[PDB]
Write a protein that binds this ligand. Structure first.
Ligand SMILES: *[C@@H]1O[C@H](CO)[C@@H](O[C@@H]2O[C@H](CO)[C@@H](O[C@@H]3O[C@H](CO)[C@@H](O)[C@H](O)[C@@H]3O)[C@H](O)[C@H]2NC(C)=O)[C@H](O)[C@H]1NC(C)=O
Ligand SMILES: *[C@@H]1O[C@H](CO)[C@@H](O[C@@H]2O[C@H](CO)[C@@H](O[C@@H]3O[C@H](CO)[C@@H](O)[C@H](O)[C@@H]3O)[C@H](O)[C@H]2NC(C)=O)[C@H](O)[C@H]1NC(C)=O
Ligand SMILES: *[C@@H]1O[C@H](CO)[C@@H](O[C@@H]2O[C@H](CO)[C@@H](O)[C@H](O)[C@H]2NC(C)=O)[C@H](O)[C@H]1NC(C)=O
Ligand SMILES: *[C@@H]1O[C@H](CO)[C@@H](O[C@@H]2O[C@H](CO)[C@@H](O)[C@H](O)[C@H]2NC(C)=O)[C@H](O)[C@H]1NC(C)=O
Ligand SMILES: *[C@@H]1O[C@H](CO)[C@@H](O[C@@H]2O[C@H](CO)[C@@H](O)[C@H](O)[C@H]2NC(C)=O)[C@H](O)[C@H]1NC(C)=O
Ligand SMILES: *[C@@H]1O[C@H](CO)[C@@H](O[C@@H]2O[C@H](CO)[C@@H](O)[C@H](O)[C@H]2NC(C)=O)[C@H](O)[C@H]1NC(C)=O
Ligand SMILES: *[C@@H]1O[C@H](CO)[C@@H](O[C@@H]2O[C@H](CO)[C@@H](O)[C@H](O)[C@H]2NC(C)=O)[C@H](O)[C@H]1NC(C)=O
Ligand SMILES: *[C@@H]1O[C@H](CO)[C@@H](O[C@@H]2O[C@H](CO)[C@@H](O)[C@H](O)[C@H]2NC(C)=O)[C@H](O)[C@H]1NC(C)=O
Ligand SMILES: *[C@@H]1O[C@H](CO)[C@@H](O[C@@H]2O[C@H](CO)[C@@H](O)[C@H](O)[C@H]2NC(C)=O)[C@H](O)[C@H]1NC(C)=O
Ligand SMILES: *[C@@H]1O[C@H](CO)[C@@H](O[C@@H]2O[C@H](CO)[C@@H](O)[C@H](O)[C@H]2NC(C)=O)[C@H](O)[C@H]1NC(C)=O
Ligand SMILES: *[C@@H]1O[C@H](CO)[C@@H](O)[C@H](O)[C@H]1NC(C)=O
Ligand SMILES: *[C@@H]1O[C@H](CO)[C@@H](O)[C@H](O)[C@H]1NC(C)=O
Ligand SMILES: *[C@@H]1O[C@H](CO)[C@@H](O)[C@H](O)[C@H]1NC(C)=O
Lengths: 50, 88, 420, 198
């Protein structure tokens, strides 16, 4: 996988075989660390008009 | 602010008429030693009408006020030559 | 089956029969009109070239398409703000209802704000707000006037309407009892003001029952606020389509720019990047066109809602079927998510009776015509009464005016004319 | 900022024309924006792709311009229908619609010509000086409830008068100004006062 965002500790308890999660509109929003097997949310980095 | 981070404006607790709209009910204005201020826009003065079951208000005078209003009617006609524009 | 247009009602029409109502029912109906929609400001560069340098360099060859696409959305947002300001912000002075609620027996506690809650909205507004329920450059801008300010504007309009009639719109708010205001409303629709003062308790009870029945609705059904939910769902579906069009290929080998730049050189991936840019630009153009059309529709609806706010609420409109069905008396605004709800109070007759009528009456060879009324007969005697209500009175000289002789009017009957 | 509604349309049309005339300088993926520079550097079999790219770009620009012009023409047509309705109602008559022919009780309106627009001079009637008075819904004299024909009962503290709504012109309550309907015990708030007989 790839992308860019801040990895905050989430609470979405995944299934023992699921690796990453996708919210509506098919966007990667949560992945599981392959080493510690913890889940975390993927929030896109801040952006907006000046 | 609830519309975004604003830098360069001093937030005041007073309420004035909205001069420069920002968003989320916050507007900016250039007032008083002199810098841009930010505040929550006020909708108007509080007028408690003296209402009762036996009081009425009848005017004793009047003022003939003439106000203006502008409404668009038409716009400039445009006929662009398609071939000359694409293949001049 | 073949749909039926309604029940067949043959009106008992003749040249000497008239139906005058003897009762009435104060019916209050609701109406939902959209005012504004959610603001959208999509980053034209980040949506097409999210985290890419070659894509950003190639996008500059298409001119100022991103500039006009952003200017269209900015204009749409400014237009929605202007609509929200023009629909609600019509009074330059916030009015407050007095602590005493002696409005001639009418109960407005179900439409006035309640300080016992943080959100200063009424019960009906709370019921309305409980029904209608950032990535890839998509940003939603917050509206200028929040829900609290819209609620304050609605409360000021309602207080001005219930404490000053229609004088708060044309100028300074002139206090007037609600009974006299309703008497003026009755005089506006062509009904004598004595009917209200002689049936004030009945009209107050009918208004309270109508408001209670309105409260009964908007809590069980879901198709009442469909006009706002439809706009919300349309905007959501447009955003979903715009965000799902990124997963398309448009003829390219892949939809991800990183997967293309990592499998081809800097001379063959340009074609795929150009195809993706063209597809995403066409998608953005289609989205902006749909948003402009929807904004035009919302602006038309907001202009209609502002006209109704100015006519039905700040005055008494004689336009038929404009401020609800029936003879319009008054209206009360209510705040709604991205919209406005009007509670039109109308006057509907309930019980009519048949009477034998005549166009004129001749007493001494002089034809008499009613000043404001209609001649009716209950079988034996003749009376003169108003049109929208049955109040029979003796035909006197002060109620009729003389014009012409008897042999010129068709259908004139003989009857005595009293002299005071 | 008084005539901003017309200057805005003028500036929008000017900006649309400027964008349409500046879109020709774009490449749209081609090697150059000038067709003469492409036909003089490539043969008649490879420059066709660049010409096709330029044609597609310019056609998309023209389509976007025409769509924007159609939307703006719809807006201008709505505004012109509103202006025609106002010219028919406020100018050629007296409209009782609130806040339509300006703020206040509309009396008359005067049209004025403007560049690509119209300017109305709404002459309205606005009250200026109001006073408080004690009012009553009805008056009973001999057990008969009297109601004002066209007016409102007012009291200055000692005596009662009948006057119009939008102006203070106190008159003596006579039989010609009031009509009788019902008795006293049916109206809420009815007070005792003499009714003059002419
Ligand atoms: C309402 O009252 C008037 C008068 O009070 C009635 O008119 C009268 O009608 C009768 C019946 O036709 C007339 O009698 C006859 O008149 C003719 C001349 O037209 C004469 O040749 C006959 O010998 C007989 O007298 C009477 O003259 C006439 N009076 C007047 C003043 O015109 C009228 O009929 C009444 N309306 C109804 C619906 O009955
Ligand atoms: C307006 O005038 C009428 C009559 O001119 C007033 O009605 C009168 O009110 C007085 C005071 O209550 C009555 O006197 C008492 O009447 C009761 C019966 O209700 C009796 O038991 C007592 O012994 C005493 O006589 C009087 O009868 C009554 N007259 C009529 C004709 O109703 C009325 O009060 C006046 N309005 C105001 C605001 O004062
Ligand atoms: C992958 O290796 C890491 C470290 O070698 C493992 O993390 C350890 O997990 C055990 C049991 O959960 C803990 O007692 C240790 O403290 C952890 N060490 C560290 C450094 O975190 C991890 O469990 C291994 N994962 C798998 C699937 O084998
Ligand atoms: C109604 O209002 C008008 C306008 O203010 C008053 O006219 C003014 O009256 C004062 C008092 O003498 C004069 O000094 C001004 O010159 C008048 N102005 C104009 C334009 O005429 C008028 O007096 C008021 N009438 C009442 C009964 O209060
Ligand atoms: C006019 O209609 C109203 C409403 O139907 C009538 O009020 C009802 O009258 C009946 C008969 O006395 C009562 O049982 C109901 O409780 C009344 N309803 C309300 C809401 O008050 C009224 O009587 C009718 N008037 C005439 C003259 O027919
Ligand atoms: C106006 O209507 C409201 C609600 O219909 C009335 O409030 C009710 O008052 C009774 C009296 O004790 C309570 O038992 C109810 O619980 C109240 N209901 C609500 C929803 O608050 C109110 O009293 C009415 N006003 C007048 C003047 O009668
Ligand atoms: C038509 O209306 C008149 C007036 O109300 C009725 O005349 C009255 O009838 C009642 C009931 O019989 C009597 O007590 C009154 O003395 C009558 N008054 C007069 C002046 O005659 C008449 O009965 C009504 N006719 C019909 C068919 O309803
Ligand atoms: C209403 O229409 C009826 C039906 O034509 C009229 O009754 C006729 O009137 C003429 C003229 O008086 C007589 O010659 C006929 O014999 C009548 N026919 C019947 C069946 O009665 C009646 O006159 C009309 N009334 C008015 C006021 O125009
Ligand atoms: C209420 O209006 C009446 C009618 O004008 C006033 O009565 C007059 O008052 C003037 C001034 O004192 C006297 O010159 C008249 O003789 C009075 N006329 C009558 C018929 O009494 C009354 O003074 C006014 N009251 C108040 C409190 O302003
Ligand atoms: C207007 O409202 C006031 C306030 O309730 C009324 O004053 C009360 O009237 C009742 C009935 O006459 C008395 O029992 C109370 O003692 C009065 N209270 C006060 C504080 O005065 C007044 O009667 C109402 N007026 C009208 C015309 O309805
Ligand atoms: C505004 O109010 C807050 C909360 O009471 C207070 O902390 C702050 O000092 C106030 N600011 C001014 C300028 O009075
Ligand atoms: C009036 O007459 C029509 C036709 O005969 C009848 O249907 C209707 O019930 C009558 N009205 C009343 C109040 O009885
Ligand atoms: C009417 O009464 C209100 C409240 O008592 C007061 O503010 C107002 O000035 C009064 N009107 C006049 C003309 O004095």
């Amino acid at each position: 996988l790839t992308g860019t965002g801040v990895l905050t500790e989430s609470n979405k308890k995944f299934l023992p075989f699921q690796q990453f999660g996708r919210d509506i509109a098919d966007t990667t929003d949560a992945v599981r660390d392959p080493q510690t097997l913890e889940i975390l949310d993927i929030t896109p980095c801040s952006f907006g008009g000046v | 602010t609830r519309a975004g981070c604003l830098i360069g404006a001093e937030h005041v607790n007073n309420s004035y008429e909205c001069d420069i709209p920002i968003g989320a009910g916050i507007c900016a204005s250039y007032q008083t030693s002199q810098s841009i201020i930010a505040y929550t826009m006020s909708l108007g003065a509080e007028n408690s009408v003296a209402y009762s079951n036996n009081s009425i208000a009848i005017p004793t005078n009047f003022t003939i006020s003439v106000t203006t209003e502008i409404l668009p009617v038409s716009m400039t006609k445009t006929s662009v030559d398609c071939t000359m524009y694409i293949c001049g | 089956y073949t749909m039926s247009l309604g029940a067949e009602n043959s009106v008992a029409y003749s040249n000497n029969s008239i139906a005058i109502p003897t009762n009435f029912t104060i019916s209050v109906t609701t109406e939902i009109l959209p005012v504004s929609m959610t603001k959208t400001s999509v980053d034209c560069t980040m949506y097409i070239c999210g985290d890419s340098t070659e894509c950003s360099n190639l996008l500059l060859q298409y001119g100022s398409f991103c500039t006009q696409l952003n200017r269209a959305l900015t204009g749409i947002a400014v237009e929605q703000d202007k609509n929200t300001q023009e629909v609600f912000a019509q009074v330059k002075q916030i009015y407050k209802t007095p602590p005493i609620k002696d409005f001639g027996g009418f109960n407005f506690s179900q439409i006035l704000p309640d300080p016992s809650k943080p959100s200063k909205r009424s019960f009906i507004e709370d019921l309305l707000f409980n029904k209608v329920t950032k990535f890839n450059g998509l940003t939603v801008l917050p509206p200028l006037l929040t829900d609290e300010m819209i609620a304050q504007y609605t409360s000021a309009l309602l207080a001005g309407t219930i404490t000053s009639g229609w004088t708060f719109g044309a100028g300074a708010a002139l206090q007037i009892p609600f009974a006299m205001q309703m008497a003026y409303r009755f005089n506006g629709i062509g009904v004598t003001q004595n009917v209200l003062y002689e049936n004030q308790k009945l009209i107050a009870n009918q208004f309270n029952s109508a408001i209670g029945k309105i409260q009964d609705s908007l809590s069980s059904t879901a198709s009442a606020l469909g006009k706002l939910q439809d706009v919300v769902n349309q905007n959501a579906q447009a955003l979903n389509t715009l965000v799902k069009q990124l997963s398309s290929n448009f003829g390219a080998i892949s939809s991800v720019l990183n997967d293309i730049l990592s499998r081809l050189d800097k001379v063959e991936a340009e074609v795929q990047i150009d195809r993706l840019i063209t597809g995403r630009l066409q998608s953005l153009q289609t989205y902006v066109t749909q948003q402009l059309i929807r904004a035009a529709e919302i602006r038309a609806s907001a202009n209609l809602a502002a006209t109704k706010m100015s006519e039905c609420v700040l005055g008494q409109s004689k336009r038929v079927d404009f401020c609800g069905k029936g003879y319009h008396l008054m209206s009360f605004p209510q705040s709604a998510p991205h919209g406005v709800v009007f509670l039109h109070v109308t006057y509907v007759p309930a019980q009519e009776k048949n009477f034998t009528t005549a166009p004129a009456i001749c007493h001494d060879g002089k034809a008499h015509f009613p000043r404001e009324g209609v001649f009716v007969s209950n079988g034996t005697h003749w009376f003169v009464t108003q049109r929208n209500f049955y109040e029979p009175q003796i035909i006197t000289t002060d109620n009729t005016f003389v014009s012409g002789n008897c042999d010129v009017v068709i259908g004139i009957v003989n009857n005595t004319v009293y002299d005071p």
